[PDB]
Amino acid sequence: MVNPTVFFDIAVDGEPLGRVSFELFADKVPKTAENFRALSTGEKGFGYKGSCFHRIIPGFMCQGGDFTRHNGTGGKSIYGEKFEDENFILKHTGPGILSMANAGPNTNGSQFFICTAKTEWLDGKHVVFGKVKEGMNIVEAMERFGSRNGKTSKKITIADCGQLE
Numbered sequence: 372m373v374n375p376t377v378f379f380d381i382a383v384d385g386e387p388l389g390r391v392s393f394e395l396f397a398d399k400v401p402k403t404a405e406n407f408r409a410l411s412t413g414e415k416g417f418g419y420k421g422s423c424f425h426r427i428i429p430g431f432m433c434q435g436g437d438f439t440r441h442n443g444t445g446g447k448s449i450y451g452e453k454f455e456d457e458n459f460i461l462k463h464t465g466p467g468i469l470s471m472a473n474a475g476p477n478t479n480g481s482q483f484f485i486c487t488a489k490t491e492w493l494d495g496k497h498v499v500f501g502k503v504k505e506g507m508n509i510v511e512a513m514e515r516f517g518s519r520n521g522k523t524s525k526k527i528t529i530a531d532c533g534q535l536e
Contacts, residue, residue, distance in 0.1 A: 374398060375534060377411040379419070381509060382530040383516065391485075391506035392535060393469055396461065396499075402450075403457045403471060403479070403500040409449045410436075410481055411532045417447070419481070424527040427517025432490065433510065434472055434521075435529070436482040446481035454479050461499035463490040467510070469501035487514050 424435035439445035472482035
């Protein structure tokens with residue numbers, strides 16, 4: 372009944388930075404929320420622990436979740452390699468929105484992005500499924516390691532992750 376909460380502990384070149392936590396909107400996009408929750412706990416035998424944020428663009432977003440190829444070309448879901456766009460009820464309203472990356476219609480895997488600005492042009496094309504709860508200061512600190520082309524100047528990693536409660 373209560374929407375689940377998950378955390379990421381972030382590191383910069385192996386040195387601890389801080390924790391970001393997320394509300395997942397299981398009430399509105401249960402299938403997409405469940406995928407991200409299970410990849411965060413690792414309970415299926417694979418997931419986000421140890422993976423990096425491969426593309427960070429200040430004034431746009433931070434993208435990660437590619438645990439198979441580490442560069443933005445891979446990842447997989449708990450349902451198979453890809454799954455469908457569940458719905459587009461929720462919109463890209465501003466900083467802290469959590470949304471699925473994709474390669475065309477019905478191509479969700481494990482890659483996701485955290486918005487650092489309003490990205491309204493993505494409405495109806497990328498499935499919104501959560502938001503940052505605590506630690507937006509940590510997301511802003513991560514964003515300072517990005518660049519115009521998205522290459523990071525230090526390695527930004529999910530050192531640990533899981534579910535809170």
